Design a protein around this motif. Structure first.
Motif, PDB file in Angstrom:
ATOM      1  N   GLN A  40       2.219   9.967 -16.317  1.00 31.25           N
ATOM      2  CA  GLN A  40       0.868  10.376 -15.960  1.00 31.25           C
ATOM      3  C   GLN A  40      -0.063  10.313 -17.168  1.00 31.25           C
ATOM      4  O   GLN A  40       0.246  10.867 -18.226  1.00 31.25           O
ATOM      5  CB  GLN A  40       0.866  11.784 -15.363  1.00 31.25           C
ATOM      6  CG  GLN A  40      -0.513  12.258 -14.929  1.00 31.25           C
ATOM      7  CD  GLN A  40      -0.535  13.718 -14.522  1.00 31.25           C
ATOM      8  OE1 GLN A  40       0.512  14.337 -14.317  1.00 31.25           O
ATOM      9  NE2 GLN A  40      -1.736  14.281 -14.406  1.00 31.25           N
ATOM     10  N   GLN A  66       5.846   7.253 -10.641  1.00 24.51           N
ATOM     11  CA  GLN A  66       7.158   7.883 -10.682  1.00 24.51           C
ATOM     12  C   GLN A  66       8.220   6.869 -10.290  1.00 24.51           C
ATOM     13  O   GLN A  66       8.055   6.130  -9.321  1.00 24.51           O
ATOM     14  CB  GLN A  66       7.191   9.078  -9.731  1.00 24.51           C
ATOM     15  CG  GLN A  66       8.534   9.778  -9.633  1.00 24.51           C
ATOM     16  CD  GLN A  66       8.466  11.024  -8.772  1.00 24.51           C
ATOM     17  OE1 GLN A  66       9.470  11.702  -8.561  1.00 24.51           O
ATOM     18  NE2 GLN A  66       7.276  11.332  -8.271  1.00 24.51           N
ATOM     19  N   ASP A  96       6.995   6.426  -6.115  1.00 25.09           N
ATOM     20  CA  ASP A  96       5.574   6.628  -5.860  1.00 25.09           C
ATOM     21  C   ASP A  96       4.745   6.006  -6.976  1.00 25.09           C
ATOM     22  O   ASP A  96       5.207   5.879  -8.108  1.00 25.09           O
ATOM     23  CB  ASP A  96       5.257   8.119  -5.732  1.00 25.09           C
ATOM     24  CG  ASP A  96       3.876   8.372  -5.157  1.00 25.09           C
ATOM     25  OD1 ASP A  96       3.311   9.455  -5.421  1.00 25.09           O
ATOM     26  OD2 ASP A  96       3.358   7.487  -4.440  1.00 25.09           O
ATOM     27  N   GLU A 132       8.290  12.264 -18.237  1.00 31.41           N
ATOM     28  CA  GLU A 132       9.258  13.298 -17.890  1.00 31.41           C
ATOM     29  C   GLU A 132      10.500  12.718 -17.224  1.00 31.41           C
ATOM     30  O   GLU A 132      10.438  11.670 -16.583  1.00 31.41           O
ATOM     31  CB  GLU A 132       8.611  14.344 -16.986  1.00 31.41           C
ATOM     32  CG  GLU A 132       7.406  15.026 -17.613  1.00 31.41           C
ATOM     33  CD  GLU A 132       6.668  15.923 -16.640  1.00 31.41           C
ATOM     34  OE1 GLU A 132       5.639  15.480 -16.081  1.00 31.41           O
ATOM     35  OE2 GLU A 132       7.114  17.072 -16.438  1.00 31.41           O
ATOM     36  N   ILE A 143      14.973  10.788 -12.663  1.00 34.39           N
ATOM     37  CA  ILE A 143      13.620  10.518 -12.195  1.00 34.39           C
ATOM     38  C   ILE A 143      12.664  10.574 -13.379  1.00 34.39           C
ATOM     39  O   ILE A 143      12.758  11.471 -14.214  1.00 34.39           O
ATOM     40  CB  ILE A 143      13.161  11.559 -11.156  1.00 34.39           C
ATOM     41  CG1 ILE A 143      14.188  11.692 -10.026  1.00 34.39           C
ATOM     42  CG2 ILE A 143      11.787  11.194 -10.606  1.00 34.39           C
ATOM     43  CD1 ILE A 143      13.806  12.710  -8.965  1.00 34.39           C
ATOM     44  N   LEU A 144      11.738   9.626 -13.443  1.00 37.88           N
ATOM     45  CA  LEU A 144      10.824   9.541 -14.573  1.00 37.88           C
ATOM     46  C   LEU A 144       9.380   9.399 -14.102  1.00 37.88           C
ATOM     47  O   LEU A 144       8.985   8.348 -13.596  1.00 37.88           O
ATOM     48  CB  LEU A 144      11.215   8.366 -15.474  1.00 37.88           C
ATOM     49  CG  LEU A 144      10.573   8.253 -16.860  1.00 37.88           C
ATOM     50  CD1 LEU A 144      11.406   7.358 -17.768  1.00 37.88           C
ATOM     51  CD2 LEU A 144       9.143   7.744 -16.771  1.00 37.88           C
ATOM     52  N   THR A 145       8.597  10.461 -14.270  1.00 39.38           N
ATOM     53  CA  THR A 145       7.193  10.449 -13.864  1.00 39.38           C
ATOM     54  C   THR A 145       6.250  10.227 -15.043  1.00 39.38           C
ATOM     55  O   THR A 145       6.304  10.941 -16.048  1.00 39.38           O
ATOM     56  CB  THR A 145       6.787  11.755 -13.158  1.00 39.38           C
ATOM     57  OG1 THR A 145       6.867  12.843 -14.085  1.00 39.38           O
ATOM     58  CG2 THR A 145       7.696  12.031 -11.975  1.00 39.38           C
ATOM     59  N   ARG A 151      11.526  20.107 -17.255  1.00 41.15           N
ATOM     60  CA  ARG A 151      10.574  19.052 -17.595  1.00 41.15           C
ATOM     61  C   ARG A 151      10.125  19.144 -19.050  1.00 41.15           C
ATOM     62  O   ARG A 151      10.274  18.195 -19.821  1.00 41.15           O
ATOM     63  CB  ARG A 151       9.352  19.118 -16.674  1.00 41.15           C
ATOM     64  CG  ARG A 151       9.626  18.739 -15.226  1.00 41.15           C
ATOM     65  CD  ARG A 151       8.383  18.935 -14.369  1.00 41.15           C
ATOM     66  NE  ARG A 151       8.510  18.316 -13.052  1.00 41.15           N
ATOM     67  CZ  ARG A 151       7.561  18.335 -12.122  1.00 41.15           C
ATOM     68  NH1 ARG A 151       6.409  18.946 -12.361  1.00 41.15           N
ATOM     69  NH2 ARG A 151       7.762  17.743 -10.952  1.00 41.15           N
ATOM     70  N   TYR A 159      -1.175   7.937 -11.696  1.00 37.74           N
ATOM     71  CA  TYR A 159       0.126   8.588 -11.591  1.00 37.74           C
ATOM     72  C   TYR A 159       1.190   7.601 -11.115  1.00 37.74           C
ATOM     73  O   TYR A 159       0.915   6.714 -10.307  1.00 37.74           O
ATOM     74  CB  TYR A 159       0.059   9.783 -10.636  1.00 37.74           C
ATOM     75  CG  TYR A 159       1.347  10.576 -10.555  1.00 37.74           C
ATOM     76  CD1 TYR A 159       1.545  11.700 -11.346  1.00 37.74           C
ATOM     77  CD2 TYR A 159       2.368  10.198  -9.688  1.00 37.74           C
ATOM     78  CE1 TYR A 159       2.721  12.428 -11.278  1.00 37.74           C
ATOM     79  CE2 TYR A 159       3.548  10.918  -9.613  1.00 37.74           C
ATOM     80  CZ  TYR A 159       3.720  12.032 -10.410  1.00 37.74           C
ATOM     81  OH  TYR A 159       4.892  12.754 -10.340  1.00 37.74           O
TER      82      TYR A 159
END
Ligand SMILES: [Mg+2]
Ligand SMILES: [Mg+2]
Ligand SMILES: [Mg+2]
Ligand SMILES: [Mg+2]
Ligand SMILES: [Mg+2]
Ligand SMILES: [Mg+2]
Ligand SMILES: [Mg+2]
Ligand SMILES: [Mg+2]
Ligand SMILES: [Mg+2]
Ligand SMILES: [Mg+2]
Ligand SMILES: [Mg+2]
Ligand SMILES: [Mg+2]
Ligand SMILES: [Mg+2]
Ligand SMILES: [Mg+2]
Ligand SMILES: [Mg+2]
Ligand SMILES: [Mg+2]
Ligand SMILES: [Mg+2]
Ligand SMILES: [Mg+2]
Ligand SMILES: [Mg+2]
Ligand SMILES: [Mg+2]
Ligand SMILES: [Mg+2]
Ligand SMILES: [Mg+2]
Lengths: 147, 362
Positions: free
Chosen positions: B118, B165, B152, B206, B114-116, B296, B163
């Motif tokens: 921001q 993700q 998201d 992340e 998973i890669l967020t 993270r 934001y």
RNA sequence: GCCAGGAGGUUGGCUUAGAAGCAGCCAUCCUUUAAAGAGUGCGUAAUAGCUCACUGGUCGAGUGGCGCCGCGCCGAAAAUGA
């Protein structure tokens, strides 16, 4: 006269050699000078090629050994017509090869002098048998005939 | 392909002298009979021997494709010299294994990730840069052979992302995107600035695979103790002679709870348990945080200088501040050319800082 | 019960750091021969070591397994004295 304290079974290519295990702890907990004892190992592997030659060791009391080189396992014959370096994971269902009844006969001649089994007729069933349980079944022609 | 040769060749060369001296201290330890007597202590010994296979194999494979290949190839159109080229076509095939067997050794490199993204320091241009990075890793996935799903995403006021993700499917999804951690830096004349001068903008990134759950297994009857006792308050003789109150303490966690709102022992023993369930769920969610948030980043200020790789579009040059490596194409890199970065330098320094930490003192 | 052998290719193919009849997976050779199973259990880090299985001798008369019925044994701890 002779003398033996503890035997052991080791294997290695017919020429190359390394001190690493399982051969490692062997020539270390019983003593085996690679300064003269190994020179009896390269004498029978200079003219001959390489193979799964299992030296049927026989250690003495004086740390020495018996470098009488014995014939390779009967499984070394199946991976000679095929060329595999393993075997089926289930001897019965699947099949990794199909060496004919002839292959089992030609290279099996090498195994008779060391074995205690009789003529080539008797040394025939053993090699095919050491294949009945390694994922393969032979194919022949003459066979029974009978009356 | 002569530009990546010495890179991959010398890459397997620095392990030669170091592992040479260490395997020697171990192989001679495997000899003496007094060593194997130690139960599982000796397993750790013969274990290092299981590494003399994934090291000596390169001492033979990489050394042979370097002595034979470099010879006959110095000059000739296509006769015997170009014929020696296909001889080492498998040298690129075997190059894949040495590269792979140093990436998967990560914690959870094999599974997805998973890669967020921001935004951060850099005003609304930074809010606009984040969407650029999203559109970077997105294309980098398909072209890597991965599948992508936006878990998201939320558009900014004027930019395009406050934001975002994205869950990347496929094997090694966490492996390749690992060195993508930290804040990146952008440099260019702001499209939102009236005077249009050169501004800097930042954005954090992340990466993390995935987990599971365990709600009911905790309330095992063997763990908690249940108590019975008469109730405080009204009732008649029934309250005095009939204990209906209950105290269900969790022995390991120590957290206790008492109930007695109903006239019945079972309905109190029942309620007092549904209560303990709620608290024990909130106690497992607290501990579920350190082991799913500390991965993270141990820092990440997102401020200035917190970056690890700058992308300057004015002078056209990206630059990884970790490997010191440089480049001359920010326009294409922000499109999918991450391979050149992750492959040679990124995964290298990433595993280096941890691979030098263990093989020395940690 | 006691005297002796109890093996050869074989260290079975594959998994595995090791799996040498003996963690697990898959399994159906032969031969010295009177007999010894690609193996009953222990012993091992992996082996060697012990034993049965089987054959030889001695002994010298019965012996071993399974199904059925009768009665019985264990399973079986309490508060005033049995
Ligand atoms: Mg032996
Ligand atoms: Mg229990
Ligand atoms: Mg109270
Ligand atoms: Mg009342
Ligand atoms: Mg009352
Ligand atoms: Mg009552
Ligand atoms: Mg009562
Ligand atoms: Mg007697
Ligand atoms: Mg005996
Ligand atoms: Mg005896
Ligand atoms: Mg015998
Ligand atoms: Mg016997
Ligand atoms: Mg004996
Ligand atoms: Mg057989
Ligand atoms: Mg056998
Ligand atoms: Mg034995
Ligand atoms: Mg013993
Ligand atoms: Mg009955
Ligand atoms: Mg009955
Ligand atoms: Mg009764
Ligand atoms: Mg009693
Ligand atoms: Mg009483």
């Amino acid at each position: 006269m002779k003398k033996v304290v503890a035997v052991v079974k080791l294997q290695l290519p017919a020429g190359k050699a390394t001190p690493a295990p399982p051969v490692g702890p062997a020539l270390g907990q019983h003593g085996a000078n690679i300064m003269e004892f190994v020179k009896a190992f390269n004498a029978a592997t200079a003219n001959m090629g390489d193979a799964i030659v299992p030296v049927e060791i026989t250690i003495y009391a004086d740390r020495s050994f018996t470098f009488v080189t014995k014939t390779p396992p009967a499984s070394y014959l199946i991976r000679k017509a095929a060329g595999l370096e393993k075997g089926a994971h289930k001897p019965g269902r699947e099949k990794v090869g199909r060496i004919t009844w002839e292959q089992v006969l030609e290279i099996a001649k090498q195994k008779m002098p060391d074995l205690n089994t009789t003529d080539l007729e008797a040394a025939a069933r053993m090699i095919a048998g050491s294949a009945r349980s390694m994922g393969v079944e032979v194919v022949g022609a003459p066979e029974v005939k009978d009356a | 392909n002569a530009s990546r040769n010495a890179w991959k060749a010398s890459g397997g060369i620095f392990d030669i002298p170091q592992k040479e001296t260490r395997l020697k201290e171990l192989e001679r330890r495997l000899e003496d009979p007094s060593l194997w007597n130690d139960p599982e202590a000796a397993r750790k010994v013969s274990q290092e021997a299981a590494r003399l296979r994934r090291t000596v194999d390169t001492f033979r494979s990489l050394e042979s494709d370097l002595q034979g290949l470099l010879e006959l190839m110095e000059e000739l159109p296509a006769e015997e010299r170009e014929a020696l080229k296909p001889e080492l076509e498998e040298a690129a095939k075997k190059l894949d294994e040495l590269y792979h067997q140093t990436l998967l050794n990560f914690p959870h490199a094999e599974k997805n990730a998973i890669l967020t993204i921001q935004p951060g320091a850099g005003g609304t241009e930074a809010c606009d840069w984040a969407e650029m990075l999203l559109r970077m890793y997105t294309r980098f996935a398909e072209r890597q052979g991965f599948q992508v799903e936006v878990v998201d995403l939320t558009p900014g006021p004027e930019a395009g992302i406050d934001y975002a993700q994205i869950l990347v499917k496929g094997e090694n999804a966490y492996g390749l995107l690992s060195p993508e951690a930290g804040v990146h830096r952008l440099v260019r004349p702001s499209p939102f600035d009236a005077s249009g001068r050169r501004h800097t903008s930042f954005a954090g990134v992340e990466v993390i695979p995935e987990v599971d759950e365990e709600v009911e297994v905790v309330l095992k009857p063997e763990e908690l103790r249940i108590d019975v006792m008469r109730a405080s308050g009204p009732g008649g003789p029934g309250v005095n002679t009939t204990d209906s109150a209950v105290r269900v303490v969790h022995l390991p966690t120590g957290i206790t709870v008492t109930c007695q709102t109903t006239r019945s022992q079972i309905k109190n023993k029942e309620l007092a348990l549904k209560i303990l369930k709620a608290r024990l769920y909130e106690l497992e969610r607290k501990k579920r945080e350190e082991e799913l948030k500390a991965l993270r980043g141990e820092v990440r200020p997102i401020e200035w200088g917190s970056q690890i790789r700058s992308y300057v579009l004015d002078k056209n040059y990206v630059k990884d501040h970790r490997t010191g490596l440089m480049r001359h194409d920010p326009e294409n890199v922000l499109d999918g050319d991450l391979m050149d970065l992750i492959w040679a330098g990124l995964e290298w320094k990433a595993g280096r800082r941890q691979g030098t930490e263990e093989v020395e003192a940690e």
